[PDB]
Amino acid sequence: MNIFEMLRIDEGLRLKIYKDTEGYYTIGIGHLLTKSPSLNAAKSELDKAIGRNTNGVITKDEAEKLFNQDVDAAVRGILRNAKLKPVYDSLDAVRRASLINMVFQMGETGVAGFTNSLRMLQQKRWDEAAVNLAKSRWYNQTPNRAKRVITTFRTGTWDAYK
Ligand SMILES: [Cl-]
Ligand SMILES: [Cl-]
Numbered sequence: 001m002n003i004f005e006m007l008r009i010d011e012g013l014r015l016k017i018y019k020d021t022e023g024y025y026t027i028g029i030g031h032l033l034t035k036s037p038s039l040n041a042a043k044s045e046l047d048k049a050i051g052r053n054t055n056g057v058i059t060k061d062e063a064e065k066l067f068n069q070d071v072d073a074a075v076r077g078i079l080r081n082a083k084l085k086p087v088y089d090s091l092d093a094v095r096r097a098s099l100i101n102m103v104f105q106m107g108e109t110g111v112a113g114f115t116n117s118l119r120m121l122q123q124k125r126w127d128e129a130a131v132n133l134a135k136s137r138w139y140n141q142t143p144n145r146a147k148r149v150i151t152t153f154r155t156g157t158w159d160a161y162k
Contacts, residue, residue, distance in 0.1 A: 013063060015057055029066070031063075074103045090122045091121065098153045120132055
């Protein structure tokens, strides 16, 4: 199991524009297109991301390409972030995947906002971090996915994904 397979389970794969859990236009494996209500604004963003006139549909290869870019970007954003980087550097391989998953989902800014949980993870206080991570809108809005990520942080294994 790895970050790609992990995010593929959490995000699914859809080849046609769809609305995410927050009602935003998305495509492929969790690739956010726009927060605008406009479907035309989303098709425009899509064509721009793909480099062709897609009329709202993409192929599996195209979805996987956006996916590879988004994972790369999540990692690079963590490494560039003064608050995230030290956490990431401190974690083992499995838990690092957990942090990438959160950044992919809610953005670098959003994760960097989990001040107390980050401090707990850096200190390796797994049980405490798990409790603090759950007191969040994130957990309350997408509980099943949040629990899988939190269990991964707590145990350092991929059990929640098997
Ligand atoms: Cl893009
Ligand atoms: Cl969920």
